[PDB]
Amino acid sequence: IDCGHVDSLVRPCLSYVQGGPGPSGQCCDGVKNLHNQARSQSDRQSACNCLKGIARGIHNLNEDNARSIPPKCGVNLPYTISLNIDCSRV
Ligand SMILES: CCCCCCCCCCCCCC(=O)OC[C@@H](O)COP(=O)(O)OCC[N+](C)(C)C
Ligand SMILES: CCCCCCCCCCCCCC(=O)OC[C@@H](O)COP(=O)(O)OCC[N+](C)(C)C
Numbered sequence: 001i002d003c004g005h006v007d008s009l010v011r012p013c014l015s016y017v018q019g020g021p022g023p024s025g026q027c028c029d030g031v032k033n034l035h036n037q038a039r040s041q042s043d044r045q046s047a048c049n050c051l052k053g054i055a056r057g058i059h060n061l062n063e064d065n066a067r068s069i070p071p072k073c074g075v076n077l078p079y080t081i082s083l084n085i086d087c088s089r090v
Pocket of ligand 1: 007010011012013014017031034035051054055057058059066069070081
């Protein structure tokens with residue numbers, strides 16, 4: 001999957017991952033859309049690598065807030081996410 005596209009889907013989550021109120025509906029929709037598009041193993045792994053690279057470039061990233069996005073947005077994942085998630089097993 002294209003990192004530019006991934007970036008566009010989650011861009012609305014920025015304010016929240018930086019400590020602001022949220023997650024907004026636009027953030028959740030982007031995440032749901034990404035979840036709906038990254039289906040094959042390659043795409044999940046690709047999307048994972050992308051998000052980890054994007055997250056590492058955010059100043060004052062709040063990992064606690066970023067981690068709670070899936071559960072707060074209603075997207076159930078069989079695991080917890082973090083900056084050190086192994087993308088080869090997602
Ligand atoms: C399905 C699982 C979902 C996982 C949740 C993902 C959480 C992370 C989402 C973050 C999205 C926001 C990223 C972004 O779009 O960047 C916004 C930028 O303004 C951040 O700054 P940079 O890209 O580093 O730009 C450089 C800024 N400078 C020039 C001031 C240093
Ligand atoms: C929090 C700090 C920021 C770092 C950002 C890293 C987060 C990376 C998140 C990657 C998410 C991968 C994309 C995705 O949406 O996939 C979700 C799946 O892994 C979960 O769906 P399931 O079908 O339950 O997957 C289980 C495997 N199956 C398909 C064989 C059943």
